[PDB]
Design a protein around this motif. Sequence first.
Motif, mmCIF file in Angstrom:
data_model
loop_
_atom_site.group_PDB
_atom_site.id
_atom_site.type_symbol
_atom_site.label_atom_id
_atom_site.label_comp_id
_atom_site.label_asym_id
_atom_site.label_seq_id
_atom_site.Cartn_x
_atom_site.Cartn_y
_atom_site.Cartn_z
ATOM 1 N N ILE A 10 0.853 -1.186 0.000
ATOM 2 C CA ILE A 10 0.000 0.000 0.000
ATOM 3 C C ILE A 10 0.902 1.255 0.000
ATOM 4 C CG2 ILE A 10 -1.444 1.354 1.654
ATOM 5 C CD1 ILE A 10 -2.184 -2.237 0.328
ATOM 6 N N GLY A 624 -4.216 -0.644 -6.859
ATOM 7 C CA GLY A 624 -4.437 0.712 -7.370
ATOM 8 C C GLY A 624 -3.572 1.141 -8.537
ATOM 9 N N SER B 7 -7.213 3.218 -6.405
ATOM 10 C CA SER B 7 -6.123 4.195 -6.318
ATOM 11 C C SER B 7 -6.342 5.149 -5.133
ATOM 12 C CB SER B 7 -6.040 4.974 -7.630
ATOM 13 O OG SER B 7 -5.257 6.155 -7.551
ATOM 14 N N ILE B 10 -5.996 3.244 -1.598
ATOM 15 C CA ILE B 10 -4.566 3.022 -1.403
ATOM 16 C C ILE B 10 -3.931 4.331 -0.882
ATOM 17 C CG2 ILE B 10 -2.417 2.845 -2.818
ATOM 18 C CD1 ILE B 10 -5.361 0.290 -2.739
ATOM 19 N N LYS B 11 -4.261 5.485 -1.533
ATOM 20 C CA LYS B 11 -3.733 6.805 -1.142
ATOM 21 C C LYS B 11 -4.130 7.174 0.270
ATOM 22 C CE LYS B 11 -4.672 9.128 -5.170
ATOM 23 N NZ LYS B 11 -4.931 10.459 -5.784
ATOM 24 N N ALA B 14 -2.297 4.668 2.817
ATOM 25 C CA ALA B 14 -0.881 5.026 3.048
ATOM 26 C C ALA B 14 -0.727 6.270 3.903
ATOM 27 C CB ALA B 14 -0.164 5.231 1.747
#
Lengths: 697, 697
Positions: A10, A624, B7, B10-11, B14
């Motif tokens: 991740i 992703g 996406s 995941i962003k 993190a």
Amino acid sequence: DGICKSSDCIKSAARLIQNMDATTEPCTDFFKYACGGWLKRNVIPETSSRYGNFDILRDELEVVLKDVLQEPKTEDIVAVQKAKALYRSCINESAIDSRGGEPLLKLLPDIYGWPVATENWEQKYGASWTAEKAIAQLNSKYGKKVLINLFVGTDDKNSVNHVIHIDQPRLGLPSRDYYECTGIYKEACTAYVDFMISVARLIRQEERLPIDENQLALEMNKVMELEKEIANATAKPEDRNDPMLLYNKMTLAQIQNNFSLEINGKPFSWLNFTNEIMSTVNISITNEEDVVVYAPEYLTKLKPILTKYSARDLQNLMSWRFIMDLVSSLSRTYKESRNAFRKALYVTTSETATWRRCANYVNGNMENAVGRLYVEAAFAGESKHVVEDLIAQIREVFIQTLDDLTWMDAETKKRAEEKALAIKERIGYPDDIVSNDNKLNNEYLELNYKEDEYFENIIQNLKFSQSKQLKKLREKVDKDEWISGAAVVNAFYSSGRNQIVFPAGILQPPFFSAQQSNSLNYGGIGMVIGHEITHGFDDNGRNFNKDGDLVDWWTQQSASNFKEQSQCMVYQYGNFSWDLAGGQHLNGINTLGENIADNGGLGQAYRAYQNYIKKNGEEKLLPGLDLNHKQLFFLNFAQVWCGTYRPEYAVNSIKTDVHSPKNFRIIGTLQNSAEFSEAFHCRKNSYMNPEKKCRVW
Amino acid sequence: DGICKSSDCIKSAARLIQNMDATTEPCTDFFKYACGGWLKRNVIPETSSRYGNFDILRDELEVVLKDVLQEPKTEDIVAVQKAKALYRSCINESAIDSRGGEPLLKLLPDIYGWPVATENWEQKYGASWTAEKAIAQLNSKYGKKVLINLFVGTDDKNSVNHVIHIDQPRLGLPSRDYYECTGIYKEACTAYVDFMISVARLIRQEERLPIDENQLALEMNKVMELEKEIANATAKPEDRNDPMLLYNKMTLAQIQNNFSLEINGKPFSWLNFTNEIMSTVNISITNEEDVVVYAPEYLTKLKPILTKYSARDLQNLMSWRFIMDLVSSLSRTYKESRNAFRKALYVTTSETATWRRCANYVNGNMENAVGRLYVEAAFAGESKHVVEDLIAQIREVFIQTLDDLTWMDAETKKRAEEKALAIKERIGYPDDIVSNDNKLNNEYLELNYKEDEYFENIIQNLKFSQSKQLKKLREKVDKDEWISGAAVVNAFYSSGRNQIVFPAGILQPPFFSAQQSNSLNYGGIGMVIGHEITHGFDDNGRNFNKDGDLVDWWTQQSASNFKEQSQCMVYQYGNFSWDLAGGQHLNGINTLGENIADNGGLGQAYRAYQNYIKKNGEEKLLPGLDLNHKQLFFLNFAQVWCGTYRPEYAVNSIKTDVHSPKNFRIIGTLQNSAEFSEAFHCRKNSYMNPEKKCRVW
Ligand SMILES: CC(C)C[C@H](NP(=O)(O)O[C@@H]1O[C@@H](C)[C@H](O)[C@@H](O)[C@H]1O)C(=O)N[C@@H](Cc1c[nH]c2ccccc12)C(=O)O
Ligand SMILES: CC(C)C[C@H](NP(=O)(O)O[C@@H]1O[C@@H](C)[C@H](O)[C@@H](O)[C@H]1O)C(=O)N[C@@H](Cc1c[nH]c2ccccc12)C(=O)O
Ligand SMILES: *[C@@H]1O[C@H](CO)[C@@H](O)[C@H](O)[C@H]1NC(C)=O
Ligand SMILES: *[C@@H]1O[C@H](CO)[C@@H](O)[C@H](O)[C@H]1NC(C)=O
Ligand SMILES: *[C@@H]1O[C@H](CO)[C@@H](O)[C@H](O)[C@H]1NC(C)=O
Ligand SMILES: *[C@@H]1O[C@H](CO)[C@@H](O)[C@H](O)[C@H]1NC(C)=O
Ligand SMILES: *[C@@H]1O[C@H](CO)[C@@H](O)[C@H](O)[C@H]1NC(C)=O
Ligand SMILES: *[C@@H]1O[C@H](CO)[C@@H](O)[C@H](O)[C@H]1NC(C)=O
Ligand SMILES: [Zn+2]
Ligand SMILES: [Zn+2]
């Protein structure tokens, strides 16, 4: 579902996603595709001329150094107590600001003063003054090399010994091109003399001497006139890029014979000069000492120059060259004069945080004490084994590739295989810095720092560093000695020691993590490893054998073929137009070594990655990201290079930088990669996929 | 598998992972758990006294502003051309440095000069000088409020009209506590007079006047003596926290009656003073004008002070207060004098990038032109609808909660429901700034900027801003007028307009994204929305009805109960010990309003989140995080608050700051949340889960 959903994956995926610009076609511009996201977010700080991923990791490394250096701890050994004490003396601006310029004024008589800031210099100094003594004092006591650069270093033709060397000196301005003083250099040249005048004025003001601006400008413009001459006499970097040509061993009487100098009407003595330096370390020099002259042309051109300047004219330049490096260690007004000059050279409006400069100063002078603190706080020494295995895989790939190269004959491939096997690797940090307190303590034994005396501290560090170096002359090169501290974000190759170095500072993301996908590891640190290995076989390194001796191991044909294969890269890069430098073209010759290393390195890294897949199979995909691991390898390779530059940096750096700009290190390398075009399905003759592809390694 | 692998997820994941410290127990310290990772990475820059997530988003906003402001474009309307021109005049240091201090020297006679830097001030100015004219000129022409703060603003008791107001003035130093000049304030007080003396010396030096250091110190220490007196006469913030008590309407003849002043032996005229101000805008003031006095005690205490100082003593302070704010718009030497004072107050060793300060200066003076550029470049105006719906959900949750509050009687719940329904929301940006060029152009019509005249530009902006304000007196409050520009990272509540404002600048991650998990949106912007709404019902806001009028809508019992419920929060926060301020305790009274808003806001946000789940079900889990959405709601709530402070900032800010420190905004709120302890399975009486829980809203 074959997708990795771990905390590590991740983190990797978000980093890759954030930095890239997925709206760009990877076959049109891979720099924009891989880094466009990085570029939109990031802006060059006011402290920098450029900014990239190096600067990010370096800034973060400094935060670690601050944390480990700032707090005294009970269990601290003396070496650690000394680094912290040195750190504390550096960060105390109040203690520094109080002393004004007094520590410079005390030091001045020991270096034969500064004529422009001295009253009756001829009567006070010009009586016992000799070029031999003046240059020698600045060299032996403070490690400052002016007019003539005399240093002790490894003999290129016998890597176990040290020998005296003579070379052209460094100039006050960034390069010899500045001394034209027109166009892009006008402001800098003006700011350079302005800085000289400003520093001259502050010293006189402190010593309560009459200030004549007309006279300051007259004496200082003459220093610039003298340096302009010296700069013109220096050889260009393209005339110094061949190590066989640069090497010229001769006797000190032979130097005295051919390279005669007349300073202040009386001839210069190369034997007095050398002993004046070598007596500092209790080393006798014969009239029959072997000395490597790196700049015979420069010494020949130096003679007509030096006869035209007086003792005062010379000492004004000589002292200035040392003083300019000391002003930043003095009070506010001294600091402010350098800041203005810095602003003129770099278009930077602010200096780095004092704590940051201090952490860096301590790291540079005490790399083993600081390296130990760094690795204990930030580096998992268990990951030395993972890198050990990666270096082994890349070294093996280099050797196997030799078979597949058509431009070399079996005899050269045999010697290149010999060199490749003899490369010694240095990973993370020397084990001794953590396990050997006595050895650590003993390295800094002669150093005694006072917390209120920063200047005294820096001058002691200049003396120690230089005494160590001169002492090495009669000694053998130490095999177990590391060319870099652990707390460094870089990687290196030593031709003289035939060694590759990977400090702990570079063994972190985006390059490496034992918890990041292998495609990212091979794409990052794997390419760095190939880069460093390939350095042993570039236009400079290929001139040194397995033992680090400067000996020809190439057949006449294989060497003519090396130059032939390289020429492709010379034209490819020399044809790149740099938009930040106003469309000015890259110097394909100055950057050749780095371009061979980059191209060779990426190639070796991907092959090793393919070999890893053959043995272990496909890794789970990253979430992703609509990319496979073959593609993620290239994206991470390009993302280690995300960076930008100031237009004012680029216009100058293009002429002297040995590394290509980051966009071109990415573009140039992937244009030569058929595997890149395969992974990205690039149509023939798309920007990223030209028909012609250069190849050396 | 019920896990989101987009996406966006995941962003988010993190970001949440990187910031938290999973090695901390969430029930022991949720600040460390949620922010420990943020704290280890981040260091306070040398330009700041503190650093947090606000500063990160603000720094990034400034990069957007630079991008939109720096490049002139063909299709630019005149309003946009003016912002860019103003930006260009600000970033030209060479043009600024050339003028030296000349633009200040030209401006000086118009404000009755500066006695300390003027020769024969009594003969040149002290003839036509009156307190009435001097204070009035600084107020009407430049918007600078000294001795007496006369301003035009909304009438607290009739929100459709404007009325003249009289209040205590702002002081030169950050707060009235500084004027003790001992302990933590010694250095600052010394640096403050040192700054006065430095600026006095530079002006005299420029005007070629004799410099007597003894006399500069004598005149300047008298300004400090005068300001120390003024500071002591000002009411404390705890004596100004009740709006019913602060409101005192009276006639201008009534002001003239009770609040008599004797300046320079002759009595002060409140009618001349007001007309001297109001004539600037062609507005006649009767002897029967209604004026709101916010500081009747201050005017009463002002009389014995002002009789003890001469025309020269007063003008020295008055002019200094304006001059101190102008020095940064002048050359290097003027700038350098403020930098030293700044370094003494804030322990900051560097000023923010010029481009950054300039982008901010333009944004502050041209919020509509810059706001339009900002939203067109950075804000998806489609996301106005998503926020519109979230505000609607939170407003509904507030109304429903009223039923569940035992401390209010049905009659007060009815009026609170009335206020809650009448709240008008302002989301993103006013549509007009993008769709209405004529209205945009017309707002700045009277402004004409010259690119080489930064000072002339700033002085024109001071004149315009103040003329607009004074003009509003006879006018009705404009309903469609926004209290904030779009390009701001903050959110607000207006008691006078009964409105909540969410500028585009705060409608971005970590707070909001139509592509981020709803738990993160409710935890971030959802809490911000509840925070702003709850402000209409805090110790200050509950005093204003649905129409923004300062009228009592509470029964005697419900209001006594409000104070009773609030008292719990007073002791809870007042019992927190701040380690950065040396263990000093928080002021539970100064921070009450914000603490009620924080506690009320988080509560309303979670309920709305639960309601969202009831209607739509559980969202897919985030990868790499072993947390459910109930837990992710609280983690994101705490992560919007990740931040730190300098010990030197904390020791002072603890006494005057109205918001609790970030760790305590997180700790205090979650200690009062049973839902937090449920989500995290906190054992009874664990640090984060005390048995007693405060509750207002
Ligand atoms: C593969 C790379 C990680 C390391 C690689 N070092 P290398 O070229 O072997 O060696 C570098 O340049 C030589 C000319 C000098 O002699 C060396 O002292 C060293 O500066 C390099 O490109 N260094 C560049 C850029 C760089 C240094 N550290 C980085 C960290 C991240 C990204 C880029 C860099 C430089 O030193 O200028
Ligand atoms: C919920 C929060 C996002 C907004 C919230 N604004 P709010 O308290 O309504 O109002 C703020 O404080 C008042 C006293 C002032 O009158 C207002 O001008 C404004 O500064 C606040 O806590 N502001 C703080 C902290 C803050 C501002 N912007 C941020 C962005 C991110 C994180 C924190 C902040 C402050 O203004 O000091
Ligand atoms: C700074 O230096 C002075 C001079 O000796 C000393 O009094 C002071 O303790 C120093 N400050 C710190 C933080 O070490
Ligand atoms: C070198 O020559 C000089 C001539 O001035 C003499 O004074 C000196 O003592 C010599 N020194 C050494 C170390 O050989
Ligand atoms: C560019 O490319 C051609 C080969 O195609 C080469 O001959 C030429 O010298 C190169 N130009 C530069 C400026 O290096
Ligand atoms: C800075 O100001 C000077 C003075 O008018 C002008 O000559 C110059 O063009 C300006 N620089 C920029 C970048 O606008
Ligand atoms: C206010 O009073 C002064 C007294 O000096 C007089 O000169 C002035 O013209 C009056 N001005 C206004 C605008 O009422
Ligand atoms: C702390 O808590 C108690 C209630 O338990 C309260 O009575 C006291 O006044 C508080 N202390 C401070 C300093 O606010
Ligand atoms: Zn290299
Ligand atoms: Zn608030």
